[PDB]
Amino acid sequence: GIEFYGPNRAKWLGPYSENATPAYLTGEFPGDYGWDTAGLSADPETFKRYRELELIHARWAMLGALGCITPELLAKSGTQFGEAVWFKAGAQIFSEGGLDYLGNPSLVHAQNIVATLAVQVILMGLVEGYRVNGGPAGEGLDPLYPGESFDPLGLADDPDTFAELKVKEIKNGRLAMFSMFGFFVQAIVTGKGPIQNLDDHLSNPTVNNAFAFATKFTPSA
Amino acid sequence: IEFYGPNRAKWLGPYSENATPAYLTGEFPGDYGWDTAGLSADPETFKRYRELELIHARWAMLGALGCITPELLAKSGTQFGEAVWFKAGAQIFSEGGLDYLGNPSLVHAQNIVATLAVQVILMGLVEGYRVNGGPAGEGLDPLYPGESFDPLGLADDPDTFAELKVKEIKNGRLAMFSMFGFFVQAIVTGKGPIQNLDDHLSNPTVNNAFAFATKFTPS
Amino acid sequence: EASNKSFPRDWVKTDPLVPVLGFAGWTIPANIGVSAFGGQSLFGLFTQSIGENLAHFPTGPALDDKFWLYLITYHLGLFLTITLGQIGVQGRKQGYW
Amino acid sequence: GFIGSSTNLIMVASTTATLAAARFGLAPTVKKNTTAGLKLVDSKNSAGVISNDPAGFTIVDVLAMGAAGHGLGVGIVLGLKGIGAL
Amino acid sequence: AIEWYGPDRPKFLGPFSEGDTPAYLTGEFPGDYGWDTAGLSADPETFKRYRELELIHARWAMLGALGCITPELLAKNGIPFGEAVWFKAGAQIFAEGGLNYLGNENLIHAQSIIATLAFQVVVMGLAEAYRANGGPLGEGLDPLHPGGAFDPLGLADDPDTFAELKVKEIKNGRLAMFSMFGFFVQAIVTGKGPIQNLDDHLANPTAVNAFAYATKFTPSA
Ligand code: CHL
Ligand code: CHL
Ligand code: CHL
Ligand code: CLA
Ligand SMILES: CC1=C[C@H](O)CC(C)(C)[C@H]1/C=C/C(C)=C/C=C/C(C)=C/C=C/C=C(C)/C=C/C=C(C)/C=C/C1=C(C)C[C@H](O)CC1(C)C
Numbered sequence: 001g002i003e004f005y006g007p008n009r010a011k012w013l014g015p016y017s018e019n020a021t022p023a024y025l026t027g028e029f030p031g032d033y034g035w036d037t038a039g040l041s042a043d044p045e046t047f048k049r050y051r052e053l054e055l056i057h058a059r060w061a062m063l064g065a066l067g068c069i070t071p072e073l074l075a076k077s078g079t080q081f082g083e084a085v086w087f088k089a090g091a092q093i094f095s096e097g098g099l100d101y102l103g104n105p106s107l108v109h110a111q112n113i114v115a116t117l118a119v120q121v122i123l124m125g126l127v128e129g130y131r132v133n134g135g136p137a138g139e140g141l142d143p144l145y146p147g148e149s150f151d152p153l154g155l156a157d158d159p160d161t162f163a164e165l166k167v168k169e170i171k172n173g174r175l176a177m178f179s180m181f182g183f184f185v186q187a188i189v190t191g192k193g194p195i196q197n198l199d200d201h202l203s204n205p206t207v208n209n210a211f212a213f214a215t216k217f218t219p220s221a
Numbered sequence: 222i223e224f225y226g227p228n229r230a231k232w233l234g235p236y237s238e239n240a241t242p243a244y245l246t247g248e249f250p251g252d253y254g255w256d257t258a259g260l261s262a263d264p265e266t267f268k269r270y271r272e273l274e275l276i277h278a279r280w281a282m283l284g285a286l287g288c289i290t291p292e293l294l295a296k297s298g299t300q301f302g303e304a305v306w307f308k309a310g311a312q313i314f315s316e317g318g319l320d321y322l323g324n325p326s327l328v329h330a331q332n333i334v335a336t337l338a339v340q341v342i343l344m345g346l347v348e349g350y351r352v353n354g355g356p357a358g359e360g361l362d363p364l365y366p367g368e369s370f371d372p373l374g375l376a377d378d379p380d381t382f383a384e385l386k387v388k389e390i391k392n393g394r395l396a397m398f399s400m401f402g403f404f405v406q407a408i409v410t411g412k413g414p415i416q417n418l419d420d421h422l423s424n425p426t427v428n429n430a431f432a433f434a435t436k437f438t439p440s
Numbered sequence: 441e442a443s444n445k446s447f448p449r450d451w452v453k454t455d456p457l458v459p460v461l462g463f464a465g466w467t468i469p470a471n472i473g474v475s476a477f478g479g480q481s482l483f484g485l486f487t488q489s490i491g492e493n494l495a496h497f498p499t500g501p502a503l504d505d506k507f508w509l510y511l512i513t514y515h516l517g518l519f520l521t522i523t524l525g526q527i528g529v530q531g532r533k534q535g536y537w
Numbered sequence: 538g539f540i541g542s543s544t545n546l547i548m549v550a551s552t553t554a555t556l557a558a559a560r561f562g563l564a565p566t567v568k569k570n571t572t573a574g575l576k577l578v579d580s581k582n583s584a585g586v587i588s589n590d591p592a593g594f595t596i597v598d599v600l601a602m603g604a605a606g607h608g609l610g611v612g613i614v615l616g617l618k619g620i621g622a623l
Numbered sequence: 624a625i626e627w628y629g630p631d632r633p634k635f636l637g638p639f640s641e642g643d644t645p646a647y648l649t650g651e652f653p654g655d656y657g658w659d660t661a662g663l664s665a666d667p668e669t670f671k672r673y674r675e676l677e678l679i680h681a682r683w684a685m686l687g688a689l690g691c692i693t694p695e696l697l698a699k700n701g702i703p704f705g706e707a708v709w710f711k712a713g714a715q716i717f718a719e720g721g722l723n724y725l726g727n728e729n730l731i732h733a734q735s736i737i738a739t740l741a742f743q744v745v746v747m748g749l750a751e752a753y754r755a756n757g758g759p760l761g762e763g764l765d766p767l768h769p770g771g772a773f774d775p776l777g778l779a780d781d782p783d784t785f786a787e788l789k790v791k792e793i794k795n796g797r798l799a800m801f802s803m804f805g806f807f808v809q810a811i812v813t814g815k816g817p818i819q820n821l822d823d824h825l826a827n828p829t830a831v832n833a834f835a836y837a838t839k840f841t842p843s844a
């Protein structure tokens with residue numbers, strides 16, 4: 001098969017990549033395809049900080065892509081939300097009747113965005129200061145893969161497949177990061193949801209691609 | 222004037238010796254001692270930034286000449302679908318195809334998707350050959366291969382090859398500056414490069430850049 | 441069989457390129473407009489059939505639906521393409537020619 | 538006229554195409570068969586048949602490639618007639 | 624806590640900052656709080672150029688954060704000069720009588736932006752190139768804090784309070800850069816002056832905040 005560590009592994013240019021990989025990317029870390037053509041991570045501590053940035057970006061982008069797909073899929077299946085499209089889902093706090101979570105008024109019923117943001121600032125500052133330092137869910141642990149409170153299902157045991165699960169996590173995270181960038185730019189240039197753009201591209205793929213919106217942000221006006 | 226070594230062409234004139242970093246000795250083309258922001262201290266990052274700069278320079282030379290050529294040829298007799306560079310892409314969706322020089326039997330391309338696909342295939346092959354190696358040269362210099370580029374044999378005599386290198390990177394830095402200028406002159410005006418050149422050479426007092434200094438004001 | 445004393449666990453020699461390349465080699469040609477479909481494609485009409493049959497989600501497709509035709513032909517060609525792709529990959533890798 | 542039409546051009550093109558493909562080592566001939574993997578290997582030839590052609594092109598070669606090219610041209614012209622291109 | 628140097632110092636996460644603060648941030652510089660989560664300054668040459676760039680950004684941001692508030696601060700007293708906001712202040716060059724300094728017509732009252740632009744280019748190139756290299760007031764000294772004629776009041780002596788005022792300068796400068804980025808985006812999103820935003824916030828905070836302008840940049844398409 002194909003492996004993802006060591007001197008030979010899966011690389012960024014594929015078969016035309018044996019001369020392409022840098023010297024410092026020896027392949028001991030998950031997701032090492034050897035793509036540092038701009039040389040941003042030549043220093044190893046810059047490389048370590050960039051690995052932490054990539055993995056936390058990866059996990060937050062996985063959560064964000066699931067949360068951009070989830071209420072739109074539930075709206076196209078059964079559920080009347082407040083505003084299921086993700087780039088207009090923020091202003092439901094200004095829908096004069098509350099933010100219904102699953103569309104039901106028995107749910108969280110939020111009406112004050114300042115208190116929502118404030119408890120988010122408190123809880124997020126607490127949890128991220130726990131992530132970088134330690135707290136009730138583990139004090140002395142790996143800053144990127146803590147374990148034994150974030151592995152209650154024990155999938156980090158047998159570490160030869162924990163390396164494979166690290167590569168799977170970083171690969172779905174990079175795909176979700178690419179998909180979140182696609183969500184952002186598609187929101188900017190189409191104004192509809194990603195599933196609405198998917199239904200559009202599935203209806204008529206010849207003109208519901210990106211090139212119909214190529215003249216939209218024209219420099220004339 | 223010598224463009225290498227301790228005394229060379231320096232970006233702040235005859236008084237810049239405090240502004241020179243230690244790692245910019247001048248063994249590479251276009252060294253003026255400008256890393257006052259300090260992003261290129263690591264030697265491998267210096268290598269990567271040099272190849273980034275050279276290919277940005279060459280692509281911006283090609284892009285500068287492609288920004289100025291069909292707009293200049295628009296007034297020399299031949300007329301295209303669109304003459305300005307920022308609307309030179311949108312002539313696919315116009316009815317009657319992308320004629321190359323305006324002639325309907327030259328290219329006449331109506332499909333941007335297969336055009337981009339053929340470009341993606343050929344460009345992926347070219348750039349994979351450029352980084353790794355391929356059939357027009359296997360293992361050579363990453364930036365200056367030889368024996369298939371410069372087939373006319375002007376890359377020999379390494380002192381004039383060094384002068385050709387510094388001239389190439391200086392023309393390329395000028396073209397990169399002008400490509401950024403083309404981008405901002407596109408976004409703030411909407412008229413092309415030589416169209417703005419005629420707008421400047423018609424009356425330069427009011428039709429300088431400050432005619433468009435209030436365009437992106439907020440409300 | 442003096443060899444094969446343990447029934448190797450890799451009895452199928454899995455190359456993950458095979459399913460991808462079979463799906464690609466059948467489906468991309470399956471999206472070429474032919475006038476027999478009225479300018480549409482086999483796979484396009486298949487996705488349309490699944491879209492119409494997903495509307496009434498609990499109840500299943502009918503017998504005169506024309507969804508079954510698209511499904512069965514698409515999967516005939518698809519399984520044949522994937523099968524021959526695995527065969528060819530492990531015939532080029534192994535001997536057999 | 539027929540001689541000079543699209544059908545005649547396509548037919549002569551296909552016939553000479555198969556013939557020049559067999560003559561110049563690009564198609565399987567009497568003297569060169571193929572393996573399972575389509576590599577041109579030589580043949581037993583099962584009788585031995587002579588030819589003055591420098592490569593060894595035979596009357597059997599031209600009969601076989603004429604039949605193949607005629608099938609190819611027939612199919613092509615009736616296809617182009619079928620899709621309305623002809 | 625009365626120190627801004629040494630191994631133990633005030634840090635950017637407070638008590639959550641023991642797992643942070645890597646080895647090349649030692650607290651030897653004014654304003655070290657252990658914030659290098661991106662890892663941009665591992666090389667001390669890169670760190671030196673980033674410190675110089677940060678401190679000249681600090682000086683220009685402290686100049687800017689006061690030069691943007693004083694036109695509206697003298698419009699508070701009622702001195703009318705064309706326009707009081709800073710982001711529409713340049714167009715007073717192109718007025719019917721030109722940009723006036725304090726509104727009184729016997730003041731600066733210049734009209735041509737190109738001539739004063741050329742004067743600014745020549746004297747600022749000369750002054751900044753003397754700042755980088757050296758000129759008639761000190762040739763080879765600190766690129767950060769030259770002193771000499773830059774301290775005519777004698778605050779550069781007694782080096783402990785010099786270091787203390789260095790930390791004070793970088794702290795007020797970082798606050799000024801934060802304020803100037805806030806000025807830029809309050810100009811972009813709201814389109815009114817920052818002191819006008821303060822008056823609107825003090826007049827009605829609960830409904831007029833940033834979340835009132837949260838639905839402005841929504842891409843309709
Ligand atoms: C940090 C991640 C984050 C992202 C990506 C968004 C996304 C958005 N919010 Mg949202 N929010 C985010 C955090 C939060 N929001 C809210 C509460 C609200 C409200 C009340 C509203 C929004 C609205 C919006 C939209 C603004 C409309 C627009 O300009 O579209 C154009 C721009 C895009 C489509 C892409 C923008 C992404 C950006 C250019 C690139 C990504 C950079 C990061 C955002 C910066 C990193 C953040 C750091 C500080 C953590 C935008 C899609 C408004 C809305 O949806 O109404 C129609 C709105 O009313 N948000 C809270 C408090 C609970 C947040 C706290 O975490
Ligand atoms: C001795 C005088 C001398 C000085 C002061 C300079 C300085 C300069 N040289 Mg130069 N050189 C000088 C002599 C020489 N140079 C060179 C060879 C070169 C080269 C090859 C290069 C330079 C470059 C530069 C520039 C780099 C600084 C910069 O990036 O701008 C930073 C400062 C500014 C941008 C301020 C200007 C802005 C303006 C005053 C305000 C306008 C604001 C607008 C309204 C915008 C605001 C936007 C709003 C909407 C938000 C700068 C103009 C580089 C360059 O061209 O970079 C662009 C470059 O590549 N020099 C030689 C030959 C040996 C010289 C011989 O004497
Ligand atoms: C370098 C600092 C500097 C900044 C931040 C500005 C800012 C501005 N000037 Mg300006 N100027 C500056 C220097 C100078 N100006 C002028 C002469 C003029 C004139 C004649 C006019 C302006 C106008 C404007 C405004 C354009 C309105 C707009 O598009 O809003 C969108 C932009 C914002 C809301 C600010 C966003 C900030 C920005 C995106 C980030 C800041 C980083 C910059 C990219 C870097 C600065 C450039 C560097 C290289 C020097 C804008 C806020 C116009 C105006 O006020 O009328 C509407 C106008 O008519 N300026 C001169 C010559 C003396 C300058 C030299 O120092
Ligand atoms: C462009 C201005 C600038 C620059 C060059 C620096 C540079 C530096 N800072 Mg300073 N800093 C700044 C602004 C800046 N800072 C501001 C505005 C604040 C207040 C929030 C601070 C607060 C601060 C603290 C508390 C500390 C530093 C430290 C450092 C050093 C290491 C960190 C690093 O790698 O930063 C590199 C930074 C850059 C290359 C600048 C990149 C600018 C990008 C584009 C910003 C992108 C973020 C976002 C889009 C904009 C802001 C969003 C939101 C916060 C409003 C380095 C010398 C540490 C140190 O060693 O002390 C000396 C330290 O302890 N800084
Ligand atoms: C490698 C390399 C190399 C060389 O050397 C250089 C270079 C080139 C530079 C490099 C590259 C890089 C890259 C590619 C980058 C990219 C990134 C990204 C895209 C990210 C994202 C990232 C992204 C992310 C995180 C995201 C996240 C998201 C989220 C949370 C979301 C959320 C949400 C939701 C749910 C929905 C609602 O309604 C709202 C909101 C709020 C909206």
Ligand SMILES: CC1=C[C@H](O)CC(C)(C)[C@H]1/C=C/C(C)=C/C=C/C(C)=C/C=C/C=C(C)/C=C/C=C(C)/C=C/C1=C(C)C[C@H](O)CC1(C)C
Nearest residue numbers: 255256257258259277280281284287288306309397400401
């Ligand atoms: C040096 C240094 C130093 C210190 O230390 C720091 C700093 C400052 C950071 C640095 C700097 C940097 C810079 C300046 C950069 C810049 C760059 C650029 C501008 C690029 C461009 C670049 C540019 C480019 C490539 C361009 C390209 C172009 C092209 C391809 C083409 C195009 C085109 C044409 C014509 C055709 C049609 O019609 C359209 C189009 C398609 C449009």
Ligand SMILES: CC1=C[C@H](O)CC(C)(C)[C@H]1/C=C/C(C)=C/C=C/C(C)=C/C=C/C=C(C)/C=C/C=C(C)/C=C/C1=C(C)C[C@H](O)CC1(C)C
Nearest residue numbers: 658659660661662680683684687690691709712800803804
């Ligand atoms: C530390 C760290 C760490 C980690 O690791 C990484 C990271 C995150 C990257 C980092 C961070 C960073 C940051 C925060 C940055 C920011 C910056 C800024 C904001 C700057 C500004 C800066 C800013 C500045 C200078 C500003 C300046 C300003 C000015 C001059 C102004 C002026 C003016 C005035 C007066 C008024 C008039 O009417 C107009 C004008 C003309 C408008």
Ligand SMILES: CC1=C(/C=C/C(C)=C/C=C/C(C)=C/C=C/C=C(C)/C=C/C=C(C)/C=C/C2=C(C)CCCC2(C)C)C(C)(C)CCC1
Nearest residue numbers: 552553556599600601602603604605606607608609611612
């Ligand atoms: C002497 C010589 C020459 C020439 C020669 C020639 C010119 C030859 C030709 C040849 C040819 C020109 C041949 C042809 C052949 C043909 C054929 C052999 C045909 C066949 C046919 C067939 C087989 C048919 C079949 C079919 C039918 C009947 C119907 C439909 C189906 C199918 C198609 C199957 C050269 C070079 C000059 C020089 C030297 C020698």
